[PDB]
Design a protein around this ligand. Sequence first.
Ligand SMILES: Cc1cn([C@H]2C[C@H](O)[C@@H](COP(=O)(O)O)O2)c(=O)[nH]c1=O
Length: 558
Amino acid sequence: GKALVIVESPAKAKTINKYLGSDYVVKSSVGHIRDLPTDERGALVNRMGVDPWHNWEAHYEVLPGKEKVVSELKQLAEKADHIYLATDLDREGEAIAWHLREVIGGDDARYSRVVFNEITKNAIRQAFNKPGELNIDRVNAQQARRFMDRVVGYMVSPLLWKKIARGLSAGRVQSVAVRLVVEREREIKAFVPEEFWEVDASTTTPSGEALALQVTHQNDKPFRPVNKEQTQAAVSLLEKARYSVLEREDKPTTSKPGAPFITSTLQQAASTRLGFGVKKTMMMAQRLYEAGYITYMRTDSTNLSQDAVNMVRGYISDNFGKKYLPESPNQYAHEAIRPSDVNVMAESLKDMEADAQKLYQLIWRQFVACQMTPAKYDSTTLTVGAGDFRLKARGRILRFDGWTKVMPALILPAVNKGDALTLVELTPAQHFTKPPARFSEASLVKELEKRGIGRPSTYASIISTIQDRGYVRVENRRFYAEKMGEIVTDRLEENFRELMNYDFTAQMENSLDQVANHEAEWKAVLDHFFSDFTQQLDKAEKDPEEGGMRPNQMVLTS
Ligand SMILES: Cc1cn([C@H]2C[C@H](O)[C@@H](COP(=O)(O)O)O2)c(=O)[nH]c1=O
């Protein structure tokens, strides 16, 4: 009679229940149901639940207490015509859907795998309207990832305990992420500030208005003294010069709004704008999503659907006006993270705490803004001559706010070419170059994406998973490398070159995408991975005098 619909959480079940008819019975598996534990050695194989020596055979086990949950599903399955798997659209979502279908058993024809990137009336309709099949390639991709991660962790770690210290850990990508922080740490420790000066000038227009200028050239060459004397020398020359407006240029400029958020950009914005960490932002994001307020929070696509863009353009038109609505929609190049209904304001959210509302507001503003016209400004650039010196002044005036209208609310004098300015005061100032900035959780993710290391679905885990391991720590919202973090990084770099290499790591991601798109077979990809890995691991175990990993020692004076 009725149909069975399975989701992974209660909150997701309630929201989706609002859009599924009487013939549907929604049920949340409430968790993962089944998963993995916690030249071959049976001991290692059981702890991992994967066998690199018997063609990657796995040993999945239902989770604790989840046994009664299993039987409850089987019952609902026998009294339902069709079974719908409505797990989240990403790969682990596909895998979770796979585990459900394995555990419940039955004919494959009995199953369907729905896909949706937001939980709305219209989205849930098209989802169950044209349902698809479980994509085994996306499943194979997800498991391959879990398998190699497991292999690196359970096989490299034992070596680290023997060579460095008990309790240490290793991570396929985790170690690579730690390397970036370790290199940044070392950069900062070795940086040597450099002295360089600047000179500003206070002048008067003929009328008598105040005009501030900064020295840019001397002898037509850039002006950049490096000590106190070089400056005073230039200062006393400038004190006698006759100042005049050698040139004026007025050009209209514009500023365009940013593209709609994606996982990485969202985290950075949340961290920069609201001081939210990656974990905080991703938990609220998911909470808003499962509540039906925003689209799926794991994406690297900045695209927007036709309806989404048409609903927003209408909003801009009713609430802002003709001059804010571009002629044609803005096209940036799955969907971006955006509100599900542009007409629902942050203040109208129900089950959400203050910060989850602030995040929604941020997402809302970005979305609305990206579809509005750009801001217009009238820039002015005055160039002033004085002896062999050339000075400059910058000024900007807003003419049309455009997109900045949806963001919170927030001047050179009049002079013609050839006018004489009167010197009033000369102000020298000493500065010094700064060392590279420290990574933030979000910035680190940003760096990872730039290098193609993470994936919208692993960033948060990567970030969290490299902490409380004694390698890197967050202090004042910034990353700091610990000594043990450098100790382990050099070891891995010397004895696991390929695994620590940035290009090889990014390549693995491409590698994994290829399995998902049927451009590669998962076991073959795992075999090649294991081959390179065990060759590295074998040499690492040898005594250092044969090229093996160095011990964390320090011999006497003997
Ligand atoms: C669930 C999950 C998905 N993903 C991804 C990467 C892909 O961009 C995305 C879906 O891609 P696909 O449509 O090509 O299969 O799922 C991860 O990287 N890690 C995860 O844990």
